[PDB]
Design a protein around this nucleic acid. Structure first.
Ligand SMILES: C[S@@+](CC[C@H](N)C(=O)[O-])C[C@H]1O[C@@H](n2cnc3c(N)ncnc32)[C@H](O)[C@@H]1O
Ligand SMILES: C[S@@+](CC[C@H](N)C(=O)[O-])C[C@H]1O[C@@H](n2cnc3c(N)ncnc32)[C@H](O)[C@@H]1O
Lengths: 328, 108, 93, 99, 83, 76, 108, 92, 88, 98, 326, 76
DNA sequence: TCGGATGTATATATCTGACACGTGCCTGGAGACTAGGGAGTAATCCCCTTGGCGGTTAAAACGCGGGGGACAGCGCGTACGTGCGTTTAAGCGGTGCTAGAGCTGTCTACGACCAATTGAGCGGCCTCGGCACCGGGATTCTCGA
DNA sequence: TCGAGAATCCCGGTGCCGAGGCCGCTCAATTGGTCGTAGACAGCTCTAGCACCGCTTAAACGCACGTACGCGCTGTCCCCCGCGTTTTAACCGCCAAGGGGATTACTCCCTAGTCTCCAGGCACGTGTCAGATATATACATCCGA
């Protein structure tokens, strides 16, 4: 009375229960399994011609025996090209990071199994730091291609939410270990399911991700003062944190080492910062601020493009100041 | 007893917190005035006066002067876009006007 | 009697920004008119917020939102950060 | 035989039609969606009393009606009958909005 | 849930209808995109002030008095909703 | 002895003084008989602006001298 | 003791002197409020409301109605020259506009 | 327990037009009108007492705030209406 | 004898034709019709007679017979024209 | 002999007076105008000398700002000379002609 | 060392002392005596030809012997046509009111001898009812030609000032008796000299005036409540009285009889007065208000034309109201 | 006897009543056990709007009757 | 594109009165403490906001045509600019005068405060008349002859 | 010009719901005292507003001339108005759910008010430099050619 798949590398594959639980009012977990097949249909450039006769954009998907179809040709017909494992061929070496086509699919899939009720994320005190919003896949992909993480960086998402931002960075960057902290208990509860479901769907495709950890707690605590300063790149979504908890973060960011990258919604320093004898202690003394290229559908709470900012710590601006103090 | 330290110094300000606090109590604005309300207000008044004197000292330097004249305050306000929105209904005595000629009126 | 102005305090700010320039006594009288004008706008708007919400005290929460109502876009963003930085330093000392 | 009026006759009939009534001239559900997406710039859950969306509409009607009155005077001044986009820009300039 | 492209709900007949209460008898075709841009700048300023009045009251619902207070401090005072 | 302390208003008194009296003691005796505070008083002695530190004898001030009281006030 | 007589009746007014007096003390206008100040203010508010209802009842009669509608308040204010100067920055809900066509736009 | 000028607006209307009613929407506009010019006059009388270093708003501050705010012939007949009330108040 | 007040009579003339030009030159205008000068003396007579009368009546309320620099500031600032430099 | 073309010296006077901050009306004809508007109040008035300078600084700032809007109404009609219907159109949009 | 004239009807004529006391900085009582001669030179249409050879618009008037000239032809040469009084001719019957040409001259002349220091009239509390101002000869002449006083009217100037308004009405109207009251002591002190000098210069020309009385006192007193109501026409210059003392006069004017004329600077009733159930007790119920024709130089404190108002009491407006009540 | 006083919220109580009890005595006993002021209470008895003057017996009110409490408040 | 001429920026002397510094004092701001009440916060209740649904039809959209108004060019005449010479009166400086703004000191009468009382205004309630809508009546208004 | 035809005013009829009147019941306004301080008033001082002088010369005034700009006219032409269909979705009425505004009660912590103390800011005196001015020279602008 159910249906089941097979893992193309070898693990506990896929339990898809009966009648396809609700993801929305009109797609109701249909159209998702047939798109799951299309990514195993690649890289593996074999099933595009091997199942050319059978697969289609067919009708009649509300029944069960037609849903027995399009998986019976996966539970059986994958074996005719699987069989060749003897001696000369292993399917894949695990050291493959996913491309930006199927990583978007894996992160979209893991969101649907994990966030069972997305309207519960709207339960917060208004105009407080606990308001909820998400950053799209297209901007985090832009954020990775602007910070250029080397092999010795640490990534922390301050207020990671449900945690989809650290999962994209852990699957597209070869760094050591990635962190995400979250105070509010409703997205931190979905973050535990999001943690489990991400690892099992990433072993299913046999793709490699970096190591990561989703934690609870407040980043305005004494534990986090030391480990903010020990990380190379920081992402924070401070759009409605407010001026008090942005003033707190400006004096946690003053301890970061050279080449510290910070990506935020609202900037921690003005774009045209002049230094004089009145703002020497400011955080904008030691960092360069540029605005990223705005793209459509960048955030989750509005439709207009919200642009993010890039902060780069180099303490030479205050060394190119104090070099004109006795010039006149 | 302990040595007297002003409220402006413990706030890190140059504007007087204690005089701003007296003017809020004197001015019939509310029955009661919070402790941090004159600290917040004196910081905003000091910020805005540092924005004009930033820009007016730049105008005084471009005209090769070392003092700030009411002309330099006028040039500072009308050339900055957001100080022109605050002080858009304000006339400054001996301030003049920005040099602006319509492009139709120019010859050829 | 004697008077009160901001001319001691306008001059200290000027020496922090441009430590080599000066100011005439007619431009100093325009800066005193400016400080008294922005004081009346903010304290008048904050007085009106407490009466709407049926409060009898003006706190720094109401000075903050009167700054957001009165100042234009980026001026309002930096005057809020300079205001909170002063209040948090005051309460710790 | 399809009897039709000369251009300008129906338009003057519509001046008298809508300067005699007091109703709202924008459709109400498309105006309400515009209010609820400008409020998406904040975050997030705003709830908008139905009297507040009617107050925003009555104010946006009176703004635009009084702006077309000044736009019309700028077109007559240039000896035209059509209003053009440079008449809205002149009217908002002298009014102190466009700057 | 994201709501987009809603100035197009202010249609060409609606703008033409507002112009004829204003007394305009002939309208060029480029008026309609100018009027949608002037209307969006007007509503964004009033909603920005009305939402910062309902922040300070610590509410979720934008009441009709928040709009009346916001219009009053732009010089556009409005009778008939509780002012 | 005595000195003639004339004001700017046309009022001339007879203030009986001593050589050891300072200018502060001069500015204290006028208030005793007239009532003018000592931050308003100056003595024209050949145009010289006097100082409250020393006495009358240290300026070659003769008896029955014409001192013109310059009346200043506490602001402008 | 003596029979209670309202301050509006001994002033000859219809508007409440005692409610106007409470709103002056409540509203943080001054430290202290004189005795004749709410009497003077309530007489002015009653005069101005009698000027609008005079003119709006005349507009309601010309349109052959017996009640006053927000249209009749709009026609009363915009047709009177001095009520248009007070209420020139005021918009009235469901009030409409005055019928006015520019003479250039008329045919022939 | 709310309160408004609706009882007093309806009394003045019966003196001016004795057989004429008023809509409830039009009555809500007349409450906004009376509340507007209350705190328009009282805000100007508050500044006159502050400019002159006084602490009392008297009927003399109310009178010259009417002359500042009302235009022309409205200000003349509002002053003769307000002073007529004060003399009847202080005699009775 | 004569008289208790010597009445000043025209004094709008006063604001002369080369002084209405050169006010139009800070405005940036390049060419001026001959009928501007009577139009610019009706304006500046409507204005400046609304500032006085609201400058007086601040002087009357102070019982004070001499209209000071404040009361002109406060007359302006009541017509929405704040003037700096005299001044509050 | 040399003679500038019409419009040349007028543009030189734009640059001349937009560069300066001086008062453009004579001071004694303005002060005499102020004292005879004040004759309409029957009683004697005095006018502290700083108050006549405040009125002149306010009247010239009004007229200079009105000629900027007048100039934009003349360019709108494809003209270069300003004309009395440009002052009247500028004051009606601004809200003064009533 | 002086000079003297002769009265053309017969009285104590004219004492003009030495050197012509100051009336202003530049006319200094000159040009006035030679204009005084020009009105005796008429009505009497004889001296225009009889002294055609001698009188002129000559120079040299700062000396004394040339001021002995132009009065020696008055102290002697008037007698050659005066002489004919025997039997058949008297010069004039006294029942002649002056025309508006020489009455302007007599009132201008009596002002100069009486108000010795016109700047003392400016000593008042400011913005008070005691501020001083005058009404010109041209408007009082307009006021007389609009009220049309019959033989049985009483004229009162409330706040008559120095008193020049009741003098023009007493010399151009045949009524019984005219009054002027004045509280402030400086114009009331000049009013006593103005009273004396008016009668002696009006007997000098031999012209008739009505009877009048200039008094001190407050018209807001209990004495004046009864005698305001007993007068037909009232002139008041209420331009800066204020709303309190105008509210006082509105409830003194409610007792006047029918056809009561009131002329004022500011009107006591609006020009468009609608009567309803809210303003039944108002003074505008019982009077009709019209605005007089404004003329240039109408008042003394400004140059622009100030127009006055005419109030006429007829209690039929409240009888044409209460005729639509049912 | 007793009556069933159901509210609009779904809350049904057992109010032990008498025939001589007025509607004021009914509106006084609910506040004694629940705490609702008597200017907020109405009893649906076949749709009829009751009056505080008379008793329960003058409306043909049987024991164990279902009365629906209509909750009004002090304004709109 | 080139050349004589007027205008405007650049450079050097020189000088005054206005800005910046120092000093003494005094009053207003700071420190310390109490008293009480405003606002924070937790709990509860029910209005009212949101969402959905279906049918109906008003209104929007694009069917699609052609008249009138926008715009460009041209020609003519007049009114405004430029400039020169004359004439008026502003501007400066100086003296003189007094009045009225500004201040201080009494002192009294007016207003805040409080408590007790009670009637006006508010909430709830029925009800009827104005007003909206209706079909069918007559009158005018625009447009092609 | 005068019919043709579409738009609009005009005249009874029906109905329905919102205004306007009644009634009961607070709670806010009024009456009657007490108290203390704000302001009225008198008296004084002395700055600054007013008036007048003479002189120098900057600016206003008046005139003349030419030219450039306003303005009227013509002509093309394209774009805006208009009216009938197949198109979209607003509007309406209805039900349903639950967040969240609004109220009430408890109580704690923050602010007013007090007194004492003292140092920061204000007035006054002072000294010298920056900017105004004049002069000379140097380069960019203008206009005839
Ligand atoms: C706007 S959400 C961003 C979610 C995620 N970063 C993303 O963009 O997809 C910000 C989150 O920060 C969390 N947050 C706010 N303050 C925090 C704090 N002090 N410590 C930890 N998390 C915090 C809130 O719970 C909120 O869910
Ligand atoms: C403007 S003067 C009019 C002078 C005179 N009526 C004329 O027009 O020639 C008004 C005079 O009324 C006087 N006045 C004011 N109140 C008065 C009063 N209550 N009783 C008597 N005279 C009064 C004043 O002294 C003032 O001089």
């Amino acid at each position: 009375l159910e249906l089941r798949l097979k893992s193309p590398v070898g693990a506990e594959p896929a339990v898809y229960p009966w009648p396809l639980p609700v993801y929305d009012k009109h797609h109701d977990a249909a159209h998702e399994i047939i798109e799951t097949i299309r990514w195993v249909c690649e890289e593996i450039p074999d099933l595009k011609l091997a199942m050319e006769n059978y697969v289609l954009i067919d009708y009649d998907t509300k029944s069960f025996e037609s849903m027995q179809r399009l998986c019976d040709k996966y539970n059986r017909a994958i074996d005719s090209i699987h069989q060749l494992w003897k001696g000369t061929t292993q399917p894949m070496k695990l050291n493959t990071r996913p491309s930006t086509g199927l990583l978007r699919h894996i992160l979209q899939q893991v969101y649907n199994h994990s966030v069972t009720d997305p309207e519960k994320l709207n339960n917060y005190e208004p105009f407080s730091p606990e308001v909820y919003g998400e950053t799209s896949f297209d901007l985090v992909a832009q954020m990775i291609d602007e910070i250029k993480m080397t092999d010795d960086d640490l990534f922390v998402d301050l207020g990671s939410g449900v945690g989809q931002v650290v999962l994209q960075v852990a699957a597209a960057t070869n760094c050591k270990h990635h962190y995400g902290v979250e105070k509010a208990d409703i997205p931190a509860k979905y973050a535990e399911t999001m943690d489990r479901e991400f690892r099992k769907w990433m072993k299913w495709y046999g793709k490699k991700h970096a190591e990561y950890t989703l934690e609870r707690g407040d980043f305005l605590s004494e534990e986090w003062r030391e480990r903010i300063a020990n990380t190379s790149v920081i992402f924070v979504n401070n759009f409605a944190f407010g001026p008090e908890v942005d003033h707190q973060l400006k004096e946690r960011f003053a301890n970061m080492k050279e080449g510290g990258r910070i990506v935020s919604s609202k900037p921690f320093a003005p774009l045209n910062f002049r230094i004089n004898s009145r703002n020497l202690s400011d955080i904008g003394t030691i960092m360069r601020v540029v605005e990223l290229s705005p793209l459509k559908g960048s955030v989750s709470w509005t439709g207009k493009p919200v642009s993010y900012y890039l902060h780069t710590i180099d303490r030479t601006i205050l060394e190119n100041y104090f070099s004109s103090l006795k010039n006149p | 007893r302990a040595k007297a330290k002003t409220r402006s110094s413990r706030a890190g300000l140059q504007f007087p917190v204690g005089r701003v606090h007296r003017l809020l109590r004197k001015g019939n604005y509310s029955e009661r005035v919070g402790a941090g309300a004159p600290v917040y207000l004196a910081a905003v008044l000091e910020y805005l006066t540092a924005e004009i004197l930033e820009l007016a000292g730049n105008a005084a330097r471009d005209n090769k002067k070392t003092r700030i004249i009411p002309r330099h305050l006028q040039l500072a306000i009308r050339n900055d876009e957001e100080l022109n929105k605050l002080l858009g209904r304000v006339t400054i005595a001996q301030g003049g006007v920005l040099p602006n000629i319509q492009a139709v009126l120019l010859p050829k | 009697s004697r008077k009160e102005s901001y001319s001691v305090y306008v001059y200290k700010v000027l020496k922090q920004v441009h430590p080599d320039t000066g100011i005439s006594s007619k431009a100093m009288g325009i800066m005193n008119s400016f400080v008294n004008d922005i004081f009346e706008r903010i304290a008048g708007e904050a007085s009106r917020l407490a009466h709407y919400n049926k409060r009898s005290t003006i706190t720094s929460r109401e000075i903050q939102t009167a700054v957001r109502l009165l100042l234009p876009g980026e001026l309002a963003k930096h005057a809020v950060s300079e205001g909170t930085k002063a209040v948090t330093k005051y309460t710790s000392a | 035989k399809p009897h039709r009026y000369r251009p300008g006759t129906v338009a003057l009939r519509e001046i008298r039609r809508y300067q005699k009534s007091t109703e709202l001239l924008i459709r109400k559900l498309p105006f309400q969606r515009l209010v609820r997406e400008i409020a998406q710039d904040f975050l997030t859950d705003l709830r908008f009393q139905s009297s507040a969306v009617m107050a925003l509409q009555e104010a946006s009607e009176a703004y635009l009606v009084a702006l077309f009155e000044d736009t019309n005077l700028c077109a007559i001044h240039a000896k035209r009958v059509t209003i053009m986009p440079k008449d809205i820009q002149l009217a908002r300039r002298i009014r102190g909005e466009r700057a | 849930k994201v709501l987009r492209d809603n100035i197009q709900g202010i249609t060409k007949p609606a703008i033409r209808r507002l112009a004829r209460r204003g007394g305009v008898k002939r309208i060029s075709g480029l008026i309609y995109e100018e009027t949608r841009g002037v209307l969006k700048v007007f509503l964004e300023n009033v909603i920005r002030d009305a939402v910062t009045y309902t922040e300070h009251a610590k509410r979720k619902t934008v009441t009709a008095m928040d709009v009346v207070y916001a219009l009053k401090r732009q010089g556009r005072t409005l009778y008939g909703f509780g002012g | 002895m005595q000195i003639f302390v004339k004001t700017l208003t046309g009022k001339t008194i007879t203030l009986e003084v001593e050589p050891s009296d300072t200018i502060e003691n001069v500015k204290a005796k006028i208030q005793d008989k007239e009532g003018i505070p000592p931050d308003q008083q100056r003595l024209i002695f050949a145009g010289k602006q006097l100082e409250d530190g020393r006495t009358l004898s240290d300026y070659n001030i003769q008896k029955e001298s014409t001192l013109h009281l310059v009346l200043r006030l506490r602001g402008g």
